[PDB]
Design an enzyme around this catalytic site. Sequence first.
Site, short mmCIF file in Angstrom:
data_model
loop_
_atom_site.label_atom_id
_atom_site.label_comp_id
_atom_site.label_asym_id
_atom_site.label_seq_id
_atom_site.Cartn_x
_atom_site.Cartn_y
_atom_site.Cartn_z
N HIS A 29 16.87 -10.81 -13.61
CA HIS A 29 16.19 -11.64 -12.56
C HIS A 29 15.72 -12.97 -13.12
CE1 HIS A 29 15.94 -7.47 -11.21
NE2 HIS A 29 15.83 -7.98 -9.99
N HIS A 267 17.67 -14.63 -7.26
CA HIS A 267 16.63 -13.60 -7.36
C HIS A 267 16.95 -12.60 -8.48
CE1 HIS A 267 14.09 -10.18 -6.74
NE2 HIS A 267 15.20 -9.47 -6.72
N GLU A 415 -5.90 5.81 -0.16
CA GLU A 415 -5.47 6.68 -1.24
C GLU A 415 -4.62 5.98 -2.28
OE1 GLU A 415 -4.89 7.37 1.96
OE2 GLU A 415 -6.45 8.88 2.36
N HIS A 478 -2.33 18.42 8.10
CA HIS A 478 -3.29 18.45 7.00
C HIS A 478 -2.98 19.56 5.93
CE1 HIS A 478 -5.64 15.74 9.44
NE2 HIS A 478 -6.73 15.86 8.73
C1 LIG Z 1 -4.36 9.37 5.43
C2 LIG Z 1 -5.62 10.12 5.71
N1 LIG Z 1 -6.60 10.12 4.75
C3 LIG Z 1 -7.73 10.82 4.96
C4 LIG Z 1 -7.99 11.54 6.11
C5 LIG Z 1 -9.23 12.40 6.27
N2 LIG Z 1 -10.06 11.92 7.33
C6 LIG Z 1 -10.17 12.34 8.62
S1 LIG Z 1 -11.15 11.39 9.81
C7 LIG Z 1 -11.54 10.47 8.37
C8 LIG Z 1 -12.41 9.23 8.43
C9 LIG Z 1 -12.37 8.65 9.75
O1 LIG Z 1 -13.09 7.44 9.79
P1 LIG Z 1 -12.87 6.69 11.19
O2 LIG Z 1 -11.37 6.47 11.44
O3 LIG Z 1 -13.72 5.48 11.17
O4 LIG Z 1 -13.34 7.77 12.33
P2 LIG Z 1 -14.78 8.02 13.05
O5 LIG Z 1 -15.57 8.83 12.00
O6 LIG Z 1 -15.40 6.65 13.16
O7 LIG Z 1 -14.49 8.74 14.34
C10 LIG Z 1 -10.79 10.82 7.17
C11 LIG Z 1 -11.03 10.01 5.92
C12 LIG Z 1 -6.89 11.51 7.10
N3 LIG Z 1 -7.03 12.15 8.24
N4 LIG Z 1 -5.77 10.78 6.86
C1 LIG Z 2 7.89 -0.77 -3.75
C2 LIG Z 2 9.17 -1.50 -3.97
N1 LIG Z 2 10.03 -1.70 -2.93
C3 LIG Z 2 11.22 -2.30 -3.16
C4 LIG Z 2 11.62 -2.85 -4.38
C5 LIG Z 2 12.98 -3.56 -4.57
N2 LIG Z 2 12.82 -4.95 -4.91
C6 LIG Z 2 12.80 -5.55 -6.11
S1 LIG Z 2 12.37 -7.29 -6.20
C7 LIG Z 2 12.32 -7.19 -4.49
C8 LIG Z 2 12.03 -8.45 -3.74
C9 LIG Z 2 10.74 -9.03 -4.00
O1 LIG Z 2 10.67 -10.37 -3.44
P1 LIG Z 2 9.56 -11.24 -4.22
O2 LIG Z 2 8.41 -10.36 -4.69
O3 LIG Z 2 9.15 -12.35 -3.27
O4 LIG Z 2 10.39 -11.75 -5.53
P2 LIG Z 2 11.18 -13.13 -5.78
O5 LIG Z 2 12.55 -12.71 -5.12
O6 LIG Z 2 10.49 -14.17 -4.95
O7 LIG Z 2 11.26 -13.26 -7.21
C10 LIG Z 2 12.51 -5.84 -3.95
C11 LIG Z 2 12.47 -5.58 -2.50
C12 LIG Z 2 10.60 -2.70 -5.47
N3 LIG Z 2 10.82 -3.14 -6.71
N4 LIG Z 2 9.47 -2.00 -5.20
#
Ligand SMILES: Cc1ncc(C[n+]2csc(CCOP(=O)(O)OP(=O)(O)O)c2C)c(N)n1
Ligand SMILES: Cc1ncc(C[n+]2csc(CCOP(=O)(O)OP(=O)(O)O)c2C)c(N)n1
Lengths: 669, 669
Positions: A29, A267, A415, A478
């Site tokens: 690259h 690229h 996460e 879940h």
């Molecule tokens: C990807 C993911 N991570 C974690 C959870 C666990 N979980 C369930 S509801 C909640 C938090 C919800 O916050 P919000 O969306 O503001 O809901 P509210 O308490 O305001 O109703 C989480 C962290 C999930 N459901 N999905």
């Molecule tokens: C998570 C992830 N998705 C896809 C790729 C494949 N990939 C490598 S470089 C690239 C393009 C990135 O464009 P940019 O960051 O703007 O690099 P530039 O071409 O400007 O050097 C991709 C999609 C990767 N390395 N990681």
Amino acid sequence: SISRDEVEKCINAIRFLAIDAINKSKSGHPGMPMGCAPMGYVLWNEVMKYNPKNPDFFNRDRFVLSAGHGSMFQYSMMHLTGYDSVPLDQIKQFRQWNSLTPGHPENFVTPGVEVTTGPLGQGICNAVGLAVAEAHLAARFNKPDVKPIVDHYTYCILGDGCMMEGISNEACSLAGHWGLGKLIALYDDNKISIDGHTDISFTEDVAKRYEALGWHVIHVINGNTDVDGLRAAIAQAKAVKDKPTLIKVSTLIGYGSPNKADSHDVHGAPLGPDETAATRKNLNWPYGEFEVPQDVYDVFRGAIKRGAEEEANWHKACAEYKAKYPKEWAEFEALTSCKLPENWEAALPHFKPEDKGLATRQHSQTMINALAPALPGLIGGSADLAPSNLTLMKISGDFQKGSYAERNLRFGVREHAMGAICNGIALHKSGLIPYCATFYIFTDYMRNAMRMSALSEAGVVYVMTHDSIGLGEDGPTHQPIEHLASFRAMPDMLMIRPAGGNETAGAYKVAIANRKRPTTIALSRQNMPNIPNCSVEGVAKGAYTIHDTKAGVKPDVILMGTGSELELATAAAGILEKEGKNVRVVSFPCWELFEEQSAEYKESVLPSDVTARVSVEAATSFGWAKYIGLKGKHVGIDTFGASAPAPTLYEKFGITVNHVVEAAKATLQ
Amino acid sequence: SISRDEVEKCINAIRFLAIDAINKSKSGHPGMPMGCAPMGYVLWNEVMKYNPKNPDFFNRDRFVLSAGHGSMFQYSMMHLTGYDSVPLDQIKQFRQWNSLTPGHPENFVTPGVEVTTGPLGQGICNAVGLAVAEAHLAARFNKPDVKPIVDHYTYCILGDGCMMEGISNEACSLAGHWGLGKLIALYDDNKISIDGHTDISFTEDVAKRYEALGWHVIHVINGNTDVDGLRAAIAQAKAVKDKPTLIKVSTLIGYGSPNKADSHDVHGAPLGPDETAATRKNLNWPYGEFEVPQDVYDVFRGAIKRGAEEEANWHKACAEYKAKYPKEWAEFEALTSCKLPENWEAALPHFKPEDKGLATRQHSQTMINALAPALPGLIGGSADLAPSNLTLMKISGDFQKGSYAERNLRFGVREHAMGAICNGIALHKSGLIPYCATFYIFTDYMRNAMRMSALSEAGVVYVMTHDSIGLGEDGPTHQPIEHLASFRAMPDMLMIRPAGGNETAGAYKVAIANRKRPTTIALSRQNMPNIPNCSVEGVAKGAYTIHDTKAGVKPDVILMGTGSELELATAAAGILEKEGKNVRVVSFPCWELFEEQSAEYKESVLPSDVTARVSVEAATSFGWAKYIGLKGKHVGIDTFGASAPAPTLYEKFGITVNHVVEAAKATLQ
Ligand SMILES: Cc1ncc(C[n+]2csc(CCOP(=O)(O)OP(=O)(O)O)c2C)c(N)n1
Ligand SMILES: Cc1ncc(C[n+]2csc(CCOP(=O)(O)OP(=O)(O)O)c2C)c(N)n1
Ligand SMILES: [Mg+2]
Ligand SMILES: [Mg+2]
């Protein structure tokens, strides 16, 4: 110091090292490194503080290439400034077997590369973790009436691909929230990705999004020739104490190539010989292949005397500190040495069958709180699930911009960034031991970061609760099913599933001991008993025998179980025994550790002539044939789950004592 | 009309149906539904066009609850407005075995639920996909002369969790880039998540970030009592044609609960008897458990009549359209029926052994281009890797704000949102067949979306190239190892790895036929031969025999291979045969399909009395014991890879013809 003409010669030396390396490898690259050469010049010759002859100098600035595909950029800089891991010969071995210049930068291969990148978006998040570690140690140890002993910046170069990945928005939301003012990100704003110009899919206002995340934003409209403006931007970034800074640096990808600059063809493919000739001529560069003129080395190799000075100055600051603050110094030294405190393992409590059963998420809470006062480096937390994953350290508060010395990290619903941040914390190599948590099911959101812990040898502790259908009513979105298998298959990750108190302590003992390999611990929502003969030591063997009907008498049938299902195997064994069978029960908390044991140990647990074998786990049969063979049977769940109370789910899906008894009889023929 | 008093009775009925249902289940989330009830009243009674007695009415507005924990909100609205899938007895079976009211909403269980949510951030992305489907079909079929036959809005309620997840930033970046003006997102801005107030981890300016992503933003400061303001906001959103609109609606979580409102304690647990009595008193609600007043039913059940009338009026518009545009109507009708065209499979080419040995990524491009003219609903594309994944449909342009009729979707570097967007396209249930693509290694970024395809029965076709160390110099951050195992373990996902042209055609044939189950296809970077006896039909069998030394005689040893490694097994066979062995070679393109076959079929391929078995695959041994047993052997790679040319990597890691020969000799004992 030196002239604009010399600065330009230095910049062009970075471009042509990258060009010539990639023509020889016929792979890689050249575009990003050509466009970013001016940034390289400034950062390495004028801004960053580091010792090229000691990549482990504690108070060095940290650099991260989040755009890892531009690895020749970082290798060129390291070569020029005098790192012994990148001599010229290794520049000439880019992308070759056993070189110190792999295709994407790897911390585990190349001294001076801080983290492993290549998967877009990981690096910026690693940088947020590096800056966390610096802020935390600084708040914990610096004193207002002597020079600091912790004071360094975190620099990260990232591109459009990093900016499109959701993980970078997560991490950068948290960096704004934490007010991480020593994090300085430089965005290669070149309007190009692989599919072509970024207007095909990416038209958002990045600067506005960053202001919304709590960052300061500086615009460098001409990153190709405005060295003075890059100097000024970086100076301004350092004078903003209060917020992380994004420097949006507009470049031409492949700057210098008359025919392929500003195209996606530069690229990721070598310039090749006609365009290389044309670029040499267009940039007025008369130097042959891999030939850096000596006067350019004289400039960049100035890093050596500068780096030796910076490191000596730090040693003086540490001597001065130690003179006024001997007790705090001792604690700083012991922590940053990366040595674990003597007898930390004795902090772990022990259990007996008489002790009423708890969920392994509760045991986990016990281990974190038992360890925290014994391990000064333990730091971490949950992704918005502290009251469910049970992860808070009672002895500390919450890391926040008021309060960086506190040790509980509150990641919110993020996460993926959380795992990548923890990689940065670990890879600061300061003795911090990061743990992070969610429901086990949501390892799916953070899987690349976890794989990165494994690849980069970062001892991140993944604390993953609600590990099965035992969670109940929240249902199949879940409930893990394939998750244990998916992690057992992953190279160099420990996947531990403890049954009871002693095994949970044993999981944590393995995890903490392993400062160069991550550990994922699958923990239960629901109570389980403390089963006789379950032990701390048994977890370290991976699989071990907890029951034989008669000493010295070969089993008729072997029952193997993990976590909350181990009790189903011990109960099935009692039923089969009362009938006249001789049964072995094996606990299988960590398959990886079992595979590290001697052949004799393995045979001692699973004798080759006893082929009546049953496995019991509230998870898929996938993988289990390795231990149960073609004639064995699995009692578990290979389908998605359902929304119902847990005891009903175990009953309906057949994960029951009666099923284990029936399966065992089937294996006996 | 309807009185302010009566509207407030209606809003409170939603609150108490949720509360009462969650107290009976002793499990679930009353807080969101209490805070969001006013937005339910307005959307269901006044705004959305739908037929409660026909949840498949093609031109309905689509609703998606991205905050899927507040499921009782959606189930209450459906019950009240007359969906036969949610009678009162089902509200009384929330979170119970085999109910149509699971803890998080599931399209695959409850007619009227459009997608499956629970994992935060998925729903909003699915909404982007549903809106992409409407826009694409409207552009393809609406004519300026007559009423539209496609015209509907996509509504989505999401909360703070959804806002924190990187996936939503990705999909909302694309929604803005595509100018999807008929997507209206209502943000429950309640300042509360599981860990407590959002200021613990989430202080970004959400409104400003959405402005940066290209959205219109409307603030409703009082979502608890300002019904007129919600009405106005939604009207204003329907009058911004040009941008998707975020309506930031501030509520009090648990509104009504005098003691538990505005606390994380009302997030995720039942109010319980004392607090429910207190909440009844505070909201002046005299009605008993599950008792919705007759006058409130009289209002919400108005949906039945209105819905019948909306759907009839649509039929009129279709009759008028069909009278003027018979050609177009017939196409629309055929596509939207979801029936695949007669003999579409004849579009796919066949291959012979002396045809040039292409990479299976090149074969995939051929299949895509073969099917695009034959399958009017094929739509999709790569995450910034069109020139490497080889995914463009040559006969169409790029889907963009000027050009919604075009069929190539250019996702940029957003793998996770790309999958969830595809789920939304498929789940529009209008005959669109989405395909999406990245390097196979980056399935790790998009794993939950892929899982949701499986769980939600969405036939997304996952086109995943660079499937192994055969990619070469990009090295271990890019090289899959555990990924085949990780998907074979996933319930209800097909994981196909074709060897050669015919198998690749065969993989596509499976993938198309499977409208209700996703298919992931692992494709090579590198060239491979077309092997004799490889076939389109053999893919459908999962595993099939391509060589026996002598017809009708039992093999001594069975060699099984997949994809680029199948040639190693064939080459090994020949060598073993010269030593006098009878050898069977088995191509194993899809494990899941093999397990669907009859007992007799499975035994014909893998006879249970032949135990000398070798598997060959440039991926981990994990899992293979299911077919190779305790006595068989795997030739592959269980560690991470390395950065070097592919031929060097195969030699260095021992994935060679001679290693398969020696392994076969070892199994023969
Ligand atoms: C990807 C993911 N991570 C974690 C959870 C666990 N979980 C369930 S509801 C909640 C938090 C919800 O916050 P919000 O969306 O503001 O809901 P509210 O308490 O305001 O109703 C989480 C962290 C999930 N459901 N999905
Ligand atoms: C998570 C992830 N998705 C896809 C790729 C494949 N990939 C490598 S470089 C690239 C393009 C990135 O464009 P940019 O960051 O703007 O690099 P530039 O071409 O400007 O050097 C991709 C999609 C990767 N390395 N990681
Ligand atoms: Mg770019
Ligand atoms: Mg909230």
